[PDB]
Structure 1
Amino acid sequence: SNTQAERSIIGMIDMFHKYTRRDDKIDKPSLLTMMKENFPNFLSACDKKGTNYLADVFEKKDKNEDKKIDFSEFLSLLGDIATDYHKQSHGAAPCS
């Protein structure tokens, strides 16, 4: 009964919960695992352009520097990845 858009949002929440600890936040090795498992094609397009996105993603997105990614920070990471795909739809190179 859910639409594709509702299923995508529920799916992204359920993906976040594969990787959280008991405080409902994701630690650094779990974030990097999450990226490799769920965004491998995005990560390959970055590598091809000489960008290792996992080198700095945790430090970039851990805004409050508590060394965990909470849901708000995870949504900011998904916004960055979406922004990259949106710019590619307008003719930008991947990972720009």
Structure 2
Amino acid sequence: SNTQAERSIIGMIDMFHKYTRRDGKIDKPSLLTMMKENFPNFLSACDKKGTNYLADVFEKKDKNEDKKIDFSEFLSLLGDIATDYHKQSHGAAPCS
């Protein structure tokens, strides 16, 4: 029986696999769809602050500039999102 933490991690792999193309990477329109579908409250908190997270997320996370997001770059994105939530838990405003 997996724990909540283990299920969470497995769920992130399964989420990545909803959006990959045949080359095992996520293209730009698919990454935006993934964000809208899985992080809509995160995105809404950004909006309220005047920030359109989807304007630049692909360009910021496509570190090797191959116009795809691979699993390592996907993990980096999740780490950015987690870092925002962590800042919020310390009293920061969202999407700072």
TM-score range, shorter chain: over 0.9
RMSD: 0.2
Instruction: Work out the CA distance in 2 between the residues paired with 1:64 and 1:25.
Output: 13
Q: CA deviation at 1:31?
A: 0.1
Residue 80 (str. 1) matches residue 62 (str. 2): no
TM-score by length of 2: 1.00
Q: CA deviation at 1:47?
A: 0.1
Instruction: Work out the CA distance in 2 between the residues paired with 1:2 and 1:91.
Output: 32
SS in 2 for 1:84: helix
Deviations 1:11-64 (A, max 9, x none): 000000000000100000000000000000000000000000000000000000
Instruction: Work out the CA distance in 2 between the residues paired with 1:2 and 1:22.
Output: 29
Q: Among all aligned residue pairs of Structure 1 and Structure 2, give the percentage whose two residues are the same amino acid.
A: 99
Q: Number of residue pairs matched?
A: 96
In the TM superposition, structure 1's runs of 4+ consecutive aligned residues that sit over 2 Å from their partners are: none
Give the gaps of 5 or more residues in structure 2: none
